[PDB]
Design a protein around this ligand. Structure first.
Ligand SMILES: O=c1ccn([C@@H]2O[C@H](COP(=O)(O)OP(=O)(O)O)[C@@H](O)[C@H]2O)c(=O)[nH]1
Ligand SMILES: OC[C@H]1O[C@@H](O[C@H]2[C@H](O)[C@@H](O)[C@H](O)O[C@@H]2CO)[C@H](O)[C@@H](O)[C@H]1O
Ligand SMILES: [Mn+2]
Length: 287
């Protein structure tokens, strides 16, 4: 029975948003007591899962770097299982894993459009959660492969449902957010509504919550297809619609998924993960 005050101190970061109107903490460097959390979770003997997809040239361009960095920085001190989804297992980079890390790898069907490869992840993750992840871990994170861990990404990020603030918009107002604005889409968020602009590159929670996130998001994806419309920012638009309707119990600051192209302002004290430079001309095969 862990209590927020037991590990979260918002006063440590007075210059940023540390609490939502629905009482959810926004985890910033300096606000968390990882030692207290590590002991707490270690006593419960938790295991944390991490899913990552790599289809096409994303495999050669990002998978090794992602996995090598995850091995070194993700939930260190706790049992972790990496779930790798690739369309070609023969191109799977097999790196050496460290203490408390293991993995499995699954061959998936490569969708023709990169937009569907990104969106289909929602369906696939749900299938795997029901098939086995729900029986293997206490918490699960789903991440994009085009990024790299830079420092400790630990238990301070765990929660029922966890959302990530997108680096470029954490200081902007909702009406400036690139939410889906067409009412015909299931991801529609009207102007005048919205809390934050979440990044689909990182989200997680308990297997139960993530199953609901991926389900619902995929239902919206399929609905739009039936109405001959596709969200401008695909699964990210749908994920934002979901988190608006079902508020996350925990949010991570941009320090947990930073884009160095922005530079490094005062608010970003310690980067835990950074974006890989975009290389669409090579890794994507369609507009
Ligand atoms: O052809 C593709 C398109 C997408 N993805 C996966 O889906 C995520 C979403 O895509 P991307 O990173 O290209 O989205 P962006 O962050 O640039 O919007 C990627 O990180 C990959 O894990 C993939 O493996 N192959
Ligand atoms: O808007 C969703 C979309 O943002 C891309 O990042 C943009 C950012 O939104 C824009 O404000 C800035 O000027 O340029 C960035 C491109 O580097 C993300 O790359 C994309 O994945 C989505 O998250
Ligand atoms: Mn990405």
């Amino acid at each position: 029975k862990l209590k927020l005050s037991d590990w979260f101190n918002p006063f440590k970061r007075p210059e940023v948003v540390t609490m939502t109107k629905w009482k959810a903490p926004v985890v910033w460097e300096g606000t968390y007591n990882r030692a207290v959390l590590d002991n707490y979770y270690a006593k419960q003997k938790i295991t944390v899962g991490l899913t990552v997809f790599a289809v096409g040239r994303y495999i050669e361009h990002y998978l090794e770097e992602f996995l090598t960095s995850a091995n070194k920085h993700f939930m260190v001190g706790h049992p972790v299982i990496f779930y790798i989804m690739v369309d070609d297992v023969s191109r799977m980079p097999l790196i050496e894993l460290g203490p408390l890390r293991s993995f499995k790898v699954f061959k998936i069907k490569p969708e023709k459009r990169w937009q569907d490869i990104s969106m289909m992840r929602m369906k696939t993750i749900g299938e795997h959660i029901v098939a086995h992840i729900q029986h293997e871990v206490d918490f699960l994170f789903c991440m994009d492969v085009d990024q790299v861990f830079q420092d400790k990404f630990g238990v301070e990020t765990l929660g029922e449902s966890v959302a990530q603030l997108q680096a470029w918009w954490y200081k902007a107002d909702p009406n400036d957010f690139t939410y889906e604005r067409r009412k015909e889409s299931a991801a529609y968020i009207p102007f005048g509504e919205g809390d934050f602009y979440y990044h689909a590159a990182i989200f997680g929670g308990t297997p139960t919550q993530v199953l609901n996130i991926t389900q619902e998001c995929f239902k919206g994806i399929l609905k739009d297809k039936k109405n001959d419309i596709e969200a401008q920012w695909h699964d990210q638009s749908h994920l934002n619609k979901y988190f608006l309707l079902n508020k996350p119990t925990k949010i991570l600051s941009p320090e947990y998924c930073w884009d160095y192209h922005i530079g490094l302002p005062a608010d970003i004290k310690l980067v835990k993960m950074s974006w890989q430079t975009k290389e669409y001309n090579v890794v994507r095969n369609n507009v």
